[PDB]
Design an enzyme around this catalytic site. Structure first.
Site, short mmCIF file in Angstrom:
data_model
loop_
_atom_site.label_atom_id
_atom_site.label_comp_id
_atom_site.label_asym_id
_atom_site.label_seq_id
_atom_site.Cartn_x
_atom_site.Cartn_y
_atom_site.Cartn_z
N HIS A 191 67.49 -7.52 49.35
CA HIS A 191 67.16 -8.23 48.11
C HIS A 191 68.37 -8.46 47.23
CE1 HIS A 191 66.91 -4.17 46.11
NE2 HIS A 191 67.41 -4.86 45.09
N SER A 240 70.72 -0.30 43.67
CA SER A 240 70.17 -0.91 44.91
C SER A 240 71.23 -1.03 46.00
CB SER A 240 69.64 -2.33 44.68
OG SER A 240 68.37 -2.30 44.08
N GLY A 241 70.82 -0.75 47.24
CA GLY A 241 71.72 -0.92 48.37
C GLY A 241 72.60 0.27 48.67
N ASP A 259 60.64 -10.96 50.25
CA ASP A 259 61.20 -10.91 48.88
C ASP A 259 60.13 -10.74 47.83
OD1 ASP A 259 63.78 -10.81 47.57
OD2 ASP A 259 63.51 -12.82 46.78
#
Ligand SMILES: N[C@@H](CCC(=O)N[C@@H](CS)C(=O)NCC(=O)O)C(=O)O
Lengths: 241, 60
Positions: A42, A191-192, A91
């Site tokens: 995302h 995030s990630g 998504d």
């Protein structure tokens, strides 16, 4: 990271910071080999205004401790050659939220830059185990980021509890990690980045990928993370790693 | 259009990216910065302040 503390220099040499053109730090990632990172899908979706899927738009910083010191000794800056999002990424539900990023040139391993171990496909991170989340994200929902990388110790939550806490939202690609009492959690900007788990030899393995949450650090609203073991073969198929 | 593009509250959402964005605040009649999580945002969400300004200047 809400409720965390400053990481030590050299403590998470697999943690990476991803900057998009004109926008500074957007997402974390983890170094898994000289040429590849794991991150969240995302982070890399084209929208109306900007092509986040385009690898030329990003710079990865490896060996970074303090976002205000990006030319400190041992910081390595890299362009990206490729972004591979999981073909099943949605998504809207955030299912299959994982991406692979190929560096334009190899990382040089050092006291500050080193890959995390990947768990084998059959590994299970057991409920209750203390693991670590790291990142430069917000220290409160709707609040400001951290210059110095933060670390927070959190616990794997039972999938059934997770599903019940977040009804109609959890798939088997997801794992809840945090505290039912809240207070410690990943947040916007994390995030990630990887969950880091100390394993049977004392080495650190990646347990998942920072993905999403309902606010941050709230009671009965633990962070939700993409599982790593079920993607082991996909990662191998795509990277050779 | 104006209801959604200019009058909506800013939406961070559930995803944990840190995408710096602008939204129009009709109580202040200026565009302000916020950090978008990256998923399921609304229309009052602009990449640059100038676009936000073009889209919404004057709205009450
Ligand atoms: N970097 C060595 C391998 C040693 C290494 O740093 N392995 C990593 C990936 S398995 C590791 O043990 N990281 C986790 C840790 O340091 O605890 C190589 O070039 O092959």
């Amino acid at each position: 990271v809400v409720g965390g503390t400053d990481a030590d220099e050299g403590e998470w040499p697999w943690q990476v910071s991803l900057h998009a053109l004109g926008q500074g730090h957007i997402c974390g990632a983890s170094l898994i080999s000289p040429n590849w990172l794991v991150s969240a899908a995302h982070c890399y979706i084209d929208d109306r205004g900007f092509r986040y899927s385009d690898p030329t738009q990003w710079t990865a910083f490896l060996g970074l401790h303090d976002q205000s010191q990006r030319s400190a000794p041992g910081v390595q800056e890299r362009r990206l050659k490729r972004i591979i999002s999981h073909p099943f990424f949605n998504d809207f539900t955030f299912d299959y939220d994982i991406a692979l990023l190929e560096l334009e040139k190899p990382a040089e391993y050092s006291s500050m830059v080193r890959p995390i171990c990947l768990p084998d496909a059959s590994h299970v991170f057991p409920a209750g185990k203390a693991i670590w989340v790291t990142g430069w994200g917000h220290t409160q929902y709707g609040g400001t980021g951290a210059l110095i990388l933060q670390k927070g110790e959190i616990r794997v939550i039972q999938q059934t509890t997770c599903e019940n806490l977040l009804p109609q939202q959890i798939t088997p690609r997801m794992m809840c990690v945090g505290f039912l009492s809240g207070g410690v959690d990943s947040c916007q900007g994390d995030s990630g980045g990887p969950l880091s788990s100390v394993e049977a030899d004392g080495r650190i393995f990646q347990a998942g990928v920072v993905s999403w949450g309902d606010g941050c650090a709230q009671r009965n609203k633990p962070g939700v993370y993409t599982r790593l073991p079920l993607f082991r073969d996909w990662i191998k198929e795509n990277t050779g790693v | 259009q104006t209801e959604d593009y200019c009058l909506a509250s800013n939406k961070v959402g559930r995803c944990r990216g840190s995408f710096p964005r602008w939204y129009y605040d009709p109580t202040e009649q200026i565009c302000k910065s916020f950090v978008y999580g990256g998923c399921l945002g609304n229309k009052n969400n602009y990449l640059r302040e100038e676009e936000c300004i073009l889209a919404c200047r004057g709205v009450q």
